Design a binder for this molecule. Sequence first.
Ligand SMILES: C=C(C)[C@@H]1CCC(C)=C[C@H]1c1c(O)cc(O)cc1CCCCC
Length: 133
Amino acid sequence: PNLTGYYRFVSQKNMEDYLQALNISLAVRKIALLLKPDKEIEHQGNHMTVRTLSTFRNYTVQFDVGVEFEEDLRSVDGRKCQTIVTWEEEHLVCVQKGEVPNRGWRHWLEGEMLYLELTARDAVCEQVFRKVR
Ligand SMILES: C=C(C)[C@@H]1CCC(C)=C[C@H]1c1c(O)cc(O)cc1CCCCC
């Protein structure tokens, strides 16, 4: 599955649980829950760039599938992670090893629908995006 596209926010669920699990303060979560970010993906070979785009903050990550890298998440929750992305069947699976247990995420594609499950500690967030065209 090639994931290149621009994907427009559709919905989210339990994003607050996930933000709490990353130790994000109350004031910052209040605002972050109002963002409705898009995802832009460039997927060429087994290199991917993944952009989370919002009116106030972008977060970008680049990686080769299967190669561990240091992911600078300081603009998100203040941490760095040793991060690895893999293909597990048709799911793109990310484990972000560090201080926070059970931290990572899953993408999968179903037609125009890009699903995203984000996990941290006991928390699970589900986001959905719609591809354009
Ligand atoms: C880049 C952003 C739009 C923000 C940046 C600030 C925080 C605390 C969370 C991110 C966030 C947010 O506030 C709401 C979301 O729906 C998704 C994400 C991106 C989460 C990063 C995943 C590794």
